[model samples]
Target: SDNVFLRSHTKIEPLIMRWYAWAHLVSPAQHALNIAFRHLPMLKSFVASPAVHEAASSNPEMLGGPFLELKKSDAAAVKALWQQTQQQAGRQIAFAEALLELDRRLQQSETGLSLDHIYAELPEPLQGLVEVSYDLHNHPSLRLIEELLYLEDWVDGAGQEIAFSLDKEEERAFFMNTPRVDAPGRMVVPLPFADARFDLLSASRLSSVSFSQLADALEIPEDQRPAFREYFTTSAPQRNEPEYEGDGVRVRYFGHACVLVQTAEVSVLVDPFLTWDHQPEQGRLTFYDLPDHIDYVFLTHNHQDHFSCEALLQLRGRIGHILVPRNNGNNFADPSMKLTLKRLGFDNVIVMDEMADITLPDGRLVSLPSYGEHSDLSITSKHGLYLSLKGRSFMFLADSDAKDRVLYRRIIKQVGKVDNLFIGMECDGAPLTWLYGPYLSNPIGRREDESRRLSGSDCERAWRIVEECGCSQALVYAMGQESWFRFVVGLEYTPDKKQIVESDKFVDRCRQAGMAAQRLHGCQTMLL
Candidate 1:
């Protein structure tokens, strides 16, 4: 009798079979059932209808018990319920199609759409349904699906061209008749230093030399000595003219926050600054000559040093892509700055709010994230870049005082393990007066002073966090052009007789602090 119900009731039997198969195949079947209940309205109504009860009661052995039985008069009610369910289902299908169309239109718009826009436009109930679908449809998965669908198959279309060829035999004969092999072209090898020389200067060569050296070299007036020393001793090292090698990666360090990373495939100048010279009236310190063609420029923040509009203007024509934080455009103050940048040949500007993962032509993945507070009223917009290539990951944490343990843990979880940690060790507890004011002599003040600067202790704290998160290597460096004064000024101000002795103390401080801190001289290359 049960076999007759299974064999005779085609629709219910097949649905039951499918349900059983899906129960085995799909994970978390209850969750899937919830979705099925929402979508399959007609099917749901059919099972609950009184007509189904009548069929079961007439043949109790064939169907089942009282639960499935229904009277003959109830058939009309069952049909009406099923029809209503089908109409509701049809409306839902149409609504889903409309939502997809809206999504497509939003994506195609020049100004990108946000989740907020979608929420505002959609009706409350529909919005809730769409949100569930959006969560299930991961953005990365959608991109992969789009790519798979659009992939070209050239081989399938090539057969027609080959079949219609009129001179196949002639072409084969021509190929056979042609020279089997040929000698390779001659290669040109250029000299490393073509007509170039370096002249070394000594402390004794210049009058009124900066630092105490002038006291030994020449007798200078008392008033003039202090001013002269301040001028030269605190200044950053002049850019060393690079002896160019025929086309390779050229890396330029602009103090701490800025680095010009260039390669043959793409030339990217990052974080350009010209405002502060670390020494007053140094007058526009322009390092290595920037080439005419710059492929991309990355702006880490809105800080005067990191995102210099003047610097952007200089590389305007050749710059291909201008990558910046979403909120950074607000810092420009001028409403037309964006339009001006576009007019100056920076057409492909990408403004990102949070995490942006871009793949380079060399198959390296570059990830950028916002960090730190920017203004007094607003949070500092700190940004960091992570490069993953050849199974090695490098994390560059620029100008961020991220003490949030939970945030650090989250970063570790998402990025996996970082190999190299480039930390900005700019502020050392120097000019204790400027750092702590009158409380410099107090015990509590000393602790407060140490807390402010992201020094060795901060590095160690960050290091421990990284270690716990599974990172291995830590490379610490004192960052910023102005920050160098913390060490160099201390060396210059020391008594002339003890100049060499105090210089050793400065060097020892760097060594003992566990910082691989060194000045980034122009054209200096360090291979990892």
Candidate 2:
């Protein structure tokens, strides 16, 4: 037991077969339509009513419903985890019923013809993993060549894992309708999230390793090495000043739709979702307060709280370049966050398509077009970033949706006027079957799933996107209203929540249109 570190409240999480890893369960064709229509019918309806999923998980308006908060004597451990997910997901439930029988035979083809005999009506496990097409209104679809369905035989990271524990400040179990089973200060760890030894176990969170070589490179079990040596730490932590060498641009925020920005040269970050709670009366910004060289992280979409594979595998060795947002090709509800952050090892990702740009050293970045929050899914990954820096521009607008003010007055003539906007009013989102209902083959009613939601902009569509981006300030950020994002935003809000009365009427209509509004919470910082 030599070097230690790691414990700034220790969290990790990740997982996949045991559930909680999100970006559509780490996309390989959306993990076979979420293990065939969402986790084997919620694990066979929790082994057939474990007290109706413990009374709808002890209702709080059935929290993030789907139930299964486990415990009616764990119904024989939920029928032995539904017979070990039907014997380790039999080719993901026969590739999700041959992708819903190839969308029911491409709805009897004929949309202006030629899908070239739909390649002899595919489906043997989706022959050569799909391609069909059409869209100039002739409309037919299919896409998923998804980098050869990530080279078949179902990506051998044998249903990945990680899970660990320690960090707490309550509220959890909603994680896309609960799954992680075992408990007692949890631990798990089968590893493989593209194990580059997980960047030497996320660089022992601010350096120091050896504790039995990180429990023998995360193999862990010598009867869980003294509870994995209580998540490391031989003291030394108290961080902060993680390089913003400061002058002009700074930013910070860290709650829902995370942020960081920085400048004394570069640091970037956006949407990194922190809070590993190294408590100090919890003023938030945790994971040892980032920056050991972030350089660029971005990731404005692929949801699960903006692509957070448990905060990108603990800032995978202090990032470097991640950017993202170019999906559309692997479509099936838009997957590729740069091919799921390069199968989670992240070899400097990138993408950033629509109206791209980049530049940076002290500024520039661009990317934009993230309109109607994916309930209106054509799902071109999702963007909205802008940036600028030193001379201060700062847009962000994640969860975009302004319901088109002629595309924010044509993106304010290419990102011109904006000195800090940051949007997200959350205006009553969650509907399109609450996260694309296992890549739907049918089911959609309830008034067209309550009129296609998963919304964003509300107070007069975010005050006409802050008067077409003239923006002098207006904060209002990613309304997941932190309670450690209740297991990935099963939201909480109050003040008559419609994302808190439309972000308090878009921060009182951006302070009576004079500007400099606010709404951010948990932790904030600014500077520029």
Candidate 3:
């Protein structure tokens, strides 16, 4: 066992304060708010009524609710976690409160006047962390100095850990509701995400290293050594070959908005959410199916399912460049994907603004305006990508709602017709409070909250875009239908679901119009 390779299927789950880590949690400002508003409340609620939580978590109707998924028997553990979190998160909680205090002051202060007076009396937690100003309409707000805040003393890297366990199947807890705790077979390494040690750990899947050396390097606790040994073996793993070398572009749909576009010269992967450790069924593609060298990995948005940290960390060594859309700098509702990825030890992140073009070896890639699907927040960290390779063009619109056909018509006029259009048709979406509640200072009315939804294009909306783009082929994807990411996406789709019906109708409509169309699921391979 001294000289062995880490099992290819060994799961590396990054945790911040024992909760699943995502993009929002990676940034200091948003992470502090979520810990105070979202995590503590959920834990406290679970500790108060474990039975209610257990019942709700088990119900399919309450799948994505705030109910904790832990059993009633784990109440003691939940209580301990709640206590520990409150004690450890005092600074963060104070920061969250200070934000609300500043908001109150901004609203109460006289309009059309300088905020210097209000800044003089700023709360201690936000003294140097924010800048208050008014918009053109004189509505006042504060912009978080997120880059500076990341360097503050309150940002605790010790709160992070990497739980290593064997992934036999897809049995996992929902990401938003459940907090991970110590389990029998899991080994938690108390290392921050930005630590260089993770590179060696993630590399163990592709390259062999001495088991004892790695165990000591990662500082696995003495008691967890036996369990750590279970994650490694002497057997060498199978490796993925490089992508196609023959002729035209080859595209592979690796489930749920993830697609690989390969030509003889370059390979670009879009919205790279993938599954691993599954027995090959339903034409599914796992992490092992990826090419050894991925030239570019494009993230369409900052949504959890689209910008999965778990999948990104594993591919850190092989990825040459990670392209992410730009965000509204210093805004509360939007966090910088470039900064977030940089904090996670990725140095190759590039921010793409709308209409920006990055010249590729074979062709050019353009970032186009993406709208809707964000519950009308001031989030600009999403875009649709247009790639032209070997005279064949492909459009990747990950969950971009077709709210305005006028915009698509203008875009088509600029980029001309495409050969393939990969779009997401998740029309039935969650309410505003589902993903952005933690950032809210005061909750909106129920009707208003429900009216603002994180939604994508339905059949009519999708068909119009297809006609505008004049694409020869269309594929509807990113509905969160893959079972492997249900824990992260918190969605369950059936054949009768509204999203399914809408996508089916859109596919049929496109086919009737002489375009090849299908609703991509599980996996598929296409040659063009």
Candidate 4:
């Protein structure tokens, strides 16, 4: 394996520490390796989730306790578990790997650390990953995983169900982002397993214990999980609610890569990753604020920041068909997004091709190719949407760098006359392996190739898309809110001096191009 050390500990932290949720596994009962939790007193009583607990039980030494001695028997048992879990069907084997890595780094990185201090130094991704790992950033996503995968939640007849994995980045994130905890006051379990699964689980299934285990024995392999960037939850303007008299389409900008578009009465949400909230914070929209009925939830791709699990759960009964991109044929192999959501409780999920014009009751939802964020490598899981409503065209591009002008031109030709364009302007992203990691079966490329994958978009590229598309109006979307970093995109909430300057440049260029383009804010809305 090629071993290039990280520029800083933070560089390697996202890769190493997602298993931090396993830290919750350290308890007195785990006697020999419990000291790993001792230094961090706050987690002393944290619950060791069943999935996490099982791994720790298999091999406490590998659970990453620096203080614990590596016993041959312990490692052997863990290896045996992995070998037996063999075809990668629920390979609890990976947690042990994360544990060892965390213990190795935590001790080496800092001998002394505290709860506040532990989280205090995190940049962005680490902080965000923590929220998914724990609810510290947003909700108790992991706890929700524990509940959904709760031995009780597993039933023989719950369709072809899938469980969470600490090893896989996507799977780790699935449980991480939805902690299954209280929002603030009124709404507890902001995002829940479909009432059906929990309803099935809560009723108890002890009688079929043997049958359930038997079914599990013959159950399918671990399906790959998809992404959801616990989005910036800030709300957009409250129009159409009290006085619903708009003839054209109303585009509501729910912060952090979310847009709610309503054509007359037919409403649909595109890229809805709302911030986890109980009450609507200033300039943010809460889930409860959304209308009870939604026509569709148009997802750009399966990236965490774009496709959210908690948001889906929150919209449980209210949402209609969920439209996702049909890349990889939406199969069980590689945990392609279509299959991932399939196993999850969503029955009305619809998959589309790379480029297609989808007609819904509300309007036309067109799928466009989203380039950049390393799309050339085939690792980038990003896409954009083109909406035709009320004789106006609107587009929501999530970091579509438009690096390839040819692809941009093709999209423009397909879209033809875009009036309003919503594009994410983060301009900087994580590395390829930054998100998909050591778990990948295929070998990763050299360092130079690796470096290219994680980079983000630029203001120049943003201008090109708006410029070439001949868009009349442009509202830059997905400027990740600083505060929502922990729960949104796992990045530190600090401003990037470089990107700040880039945003200024982008606005100036848009103005020069005669396009009325500006950065969007929380609760920002426009009538088309």
Clashing residue pairs in all predictions, respectively, total: 10, 0, 0, 29
Off by over 4 Å in 3: 239-242
- Which portions of model 4 show Cα errors greater than 4 Å? 1-245, 276-281, 329-334, 374-376, 379-381, 442-446, 491-496
Encode model 3's per-residue lDDT on 1-528: one tens digit a residue.
577877867778888888888889888778878988899889988888899988898787778898888898888888898888888888888998788767776777748887778778888989888888888988887888878887788776768898887865367688788878888777778987878788878777777788778889899876878878898988877644436886888898888888999988888999888776756667667777888889999999888888888889888988999999888864687988888998888989988888888888778898989999999888999999999998899999989998889998999888888889989998878899988898887778899888888888999998878988999999898977777878876666888989999899999999999989988877777889
**What does candidate 3 score on TM?**
0.97
Candidate 1 Cα errors over 4 Å, as ranges: 1-250, 274-286, 289-292, 328-345, 365-367, 373-377, 389-392, 426-457, 464-478, 482-523
Name the candidate, 2 or 3, with the larger lDDT value. 3
Best by lDDT: 3
lDDT of 2 by residue, 69-177 (tens): 7788767866776788788879878887887778767766657777888778686888877887877876677787878878888666986888778858454577777
Best to worst by TM-score, what's the order? 3, 4, 1, 2
The sequence of per-residue lDDT tens digits that candidate 4 reaches over residues 375-432 is 2454334567888877888888876677776777877776687888787766656555
Task: Estimate candidate 4's alpha-carbon lDDT, on a 0 to 1 scale.
Answer: 0.47
Displacement of residue 194 (Cα, Å) in model 1 is 38
TM-score of each: 0.38, 0.35, 0.97, 0.58
What TM-score number comes out for model 1?
0.38
lDDT (10s digit) by residue, model 1, range 1-528:
101100110010001111111111111111122122322432344455746545544552332121222344544544554454346334333433443445454434414324556557664324443341122333310111111211212101110100111111112111100111111121111111100110001111111223443332334455654432322333223333323232444455554455555554655556664222223243222432444455666665544335544345434545677765543211111112233233223557865555566776443434445343231212234456665544556566655444565666667676667765555433232322221221111223555544443222244344444543444444443243333322111222223322223323433444564534333322234334
lDDT for each candidate structure: 0.36, 0.79, 0.84, 0.47
